[PDB]
């Protein structure tokens, strides 16, 4: 493989142009996430309250306690 080695023509060069290969080559994160913990603490409480009533007052009661009782 003429891999960029050798002569174009070994013709007037005094050599046979034979090539070879060199054999001897070788802190808000927790506080922002508490408000994230608090986040579903309001929705999912108001959701699980919505499962047992969507009167928007009985769920606001379960959500209000879950917001105050958790933040305590």
Partner 1 sequence: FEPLVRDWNEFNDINKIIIRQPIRTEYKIAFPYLYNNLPHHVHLTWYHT
Partner 2 sequence: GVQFHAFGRVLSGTIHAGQPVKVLGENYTLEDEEDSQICTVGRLWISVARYHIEVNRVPAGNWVLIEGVDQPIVKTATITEPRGNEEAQIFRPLKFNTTSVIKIAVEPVNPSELPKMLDGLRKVNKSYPSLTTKVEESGEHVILGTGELYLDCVMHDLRKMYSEIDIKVADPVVTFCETVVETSSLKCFAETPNKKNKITMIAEPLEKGLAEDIENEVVQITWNRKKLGEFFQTKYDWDLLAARSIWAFGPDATGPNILVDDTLPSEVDKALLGSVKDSIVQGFQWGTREGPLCDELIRNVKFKILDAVVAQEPLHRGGGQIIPTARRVVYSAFLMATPRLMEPYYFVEVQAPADCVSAVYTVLARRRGHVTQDAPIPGSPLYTIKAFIPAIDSFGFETDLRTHTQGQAFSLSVFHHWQIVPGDPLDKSIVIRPLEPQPAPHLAREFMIKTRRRKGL
Partner 3 sequence: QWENSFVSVYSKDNPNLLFNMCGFECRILPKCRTSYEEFTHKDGVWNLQNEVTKERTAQCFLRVDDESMQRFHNRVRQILMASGSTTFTKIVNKWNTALIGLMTYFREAVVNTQELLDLLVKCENKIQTRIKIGLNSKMPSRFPPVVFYTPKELGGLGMLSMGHVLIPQSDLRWSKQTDVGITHFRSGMSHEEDQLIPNLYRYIQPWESEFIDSQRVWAEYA
Q: Which is nearer to partner 1, 14 or 27 (CB)?
A: 14
> Which of 9, 11, 22, 28 touches partner 3 (CB under 8 A)?
22
- Residue position matching structure tokens 């007052």: 57
Q: From residue 58, give the alpha-carbon distance in Å to each of 5, 10, 43, 46, 65.
A: 87, 99, 13, 9, 11
Q: How many CB atoms lie within 10 A of CB 46?
A: 22
The verdict on 8 binding partner 3 (CB under 8 A) reads no
Q: Which is nearer to partner 3, 20 or 57 (CB)?
A: 20
By CB under 8 A, name the binding residues for partner 3: 3-7, 12-22, 25
């Amino acid at each position: 493989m003429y891999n960029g080695i050798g002569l174009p023509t070994p013709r007037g060069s005094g050599t046979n142009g034979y090539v070879q290969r060199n054999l001897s080559l070788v802190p808000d994160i927790l506080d922002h996430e508490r408000k994230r913990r608090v986040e579903l603490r309001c929705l999912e409480l108001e959701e699980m309250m919505e499962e047992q009533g969507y009167e928007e007052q009985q769920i606001q009661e379960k959500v209000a306690t879950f917001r105050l009782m958790l933040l305590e």
